[PDB]
Specification:
homodimer, alpha/beta, TIM Barrel, eight-stranded parallel β-sheet, about 40% helix, binds cobalt (II) ion, isomerase
Chain lengths: ~270, ~270
């Protein structure tokens, strides 16, 4: 494999189906992704110490057997209304110990929260920032880097004062939280990926390489510019994500990889 | 000059001033642009049969004197509320006669209207299409291609039924109206330039190559994909536009050109 490129498994969710007893039969897709040349995965199916209904140990064996790294995972635990109003998120913090230990057992380097809604107030946003720091701190102590993945909504303002993502970056410690920047959703939020990189150097330790459909197809994403600035950003790993397709899913995710493999501005490794 | 690339003079608006009661002292900037390697200009100052306050003939001599073609111009008479309510745009047509005659005298190959607002109703939008068709027919008769230039707003729906730009394209004869698509604002309007190219092949006879600031800096525009699909689009000429600047204006506009000169997917010519 010429370059280290990750695949988010959410991209292949249609290709994971029940076979006999198995309700999450991901092994055939994992082989297909490895054959294409993907070198790592990011999971999108965590629940109560398990990945795709499997032990972290078995999931990790499955990924490693096709020669890919268990790099990262999307999961999270939002605060209740009461936690958010009180400031007291000790209950939610209990969830994180099991999650962190399972992620570690699956050999994960990163844990990423995929989604938080826009808070109604800066106060609520700040409580979220405290939670994020507490999570990130527990992760770091266990040897895992915790991050946050955007869509488009985080470029909205809270209370017409602060942009959500900006507030989040500014009010979390760099060692507790990096941003897994989705460059497509950033653009969809009228944000410049490169300007974000320059405003917050080192905070973007992974990218979600996403486009409307196949990567580099739409005209909506300046991958050249993005990759040119990956060093300012602090990029360690890149993860392809494809949720809409011009072809069968495998072909779409394959063509998406090929764009990156053939692009001279994508280095063989960022880590 | 390796490649045929034009510049929208609005990009250098700050560098044209009243000096010695030349209300618009554009000659110094014209030379700077030529020296950069721009091969053609699109004007943005038309009034009462003059460009930048000068005769079409003198304006053309000045642009040609530095070795640049007078390719295109931004001008328009927007419909009055009365005209829109009447549905009758007949009073505006006298203005267009002079306009078109002036443009032809200036050497222009294209005239483009830079702005129409989102109308409240589809009935109003149809009046706009009627108007655009009429202008375009007159232009065609005089040997000039007539076009419409978009910002982001045209991607909005009218009456929650039709996207404005889509309606315009569908309800105007291709021979009367092409779209000078601004790829930046298309992206800002959440539109895929390439998907637009494939939906309406041949209608994009010119592109505005725009970014947030310098062309190819932001990460918000997939120029690779756009240029890859230029033939489907129907691109005949490309025109740089820069309205915001990381540097002094001439440097920003120069670096913009350099991006396209160095980019392999930008051909030497689209004629
Ligand atoms: Co994503
Ligand atoms: Co423009």
């Amino acid at each position: 494999a010429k370059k280290d490129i990750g695949i988010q498994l959410y991209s292949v969710r249609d290709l994971i189906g029940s076979f006999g007893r198995n309700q999450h039969d991901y092994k055939p897709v994992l082989k297909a992704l490895a054959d294409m040349g993907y070198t790592s995965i990011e999971a999108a199916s965590y629940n109560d110490g398990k990945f795709y209904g499997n032990t972290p140990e078995e999931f990790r064996r499955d990924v490693e057997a096709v020669g890919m790294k268990v790099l990262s995972s999307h999961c999270g635990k939002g605060l209740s209304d009461e936690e958010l109003a009180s400031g007291d998120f000790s209950e939610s913090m209990k969830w994180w110990d099991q999650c962190i230990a399972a992620h570690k057992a699956a050999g994960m380097e990163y844990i990423v929260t995929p989604y938080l809604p826009v808070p109604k107030t800066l106060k609520e946003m700040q409580t979220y920032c405290d939670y994020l720091n507490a999570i990130g701190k527990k992760c770091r102590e266990a040897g895992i880097k915790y991050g946050y993945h955007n869509h488009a909504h985080e470029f909205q303002k809270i209370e017409d004062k602060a942009v959500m993502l900006d507030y989040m970056i500014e009010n979390t410690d760099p060692e507790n939280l990096f941003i897994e920047l989705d460059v497509y959703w950033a653009v969809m939020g009228k944000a410049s990926p490169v300007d974000y990189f320059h405003k917050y150097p080192g905070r973007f330790k992974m990218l979600h390489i996403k486009d409307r459909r196949e990567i580099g197809q739409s005209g909506m994403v300046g991958f050249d510019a993005i990759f040119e600035n990956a060093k300012t950003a602090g990029v360690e790993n890149i993860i392809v994500e494809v949720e809409q397709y011009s072809y069968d899913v495998e072909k779409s995710v394959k063509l998406s990889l090929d764009y990156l493999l053939e692009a001279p501005f994508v280095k063989a490794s960022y880590s």
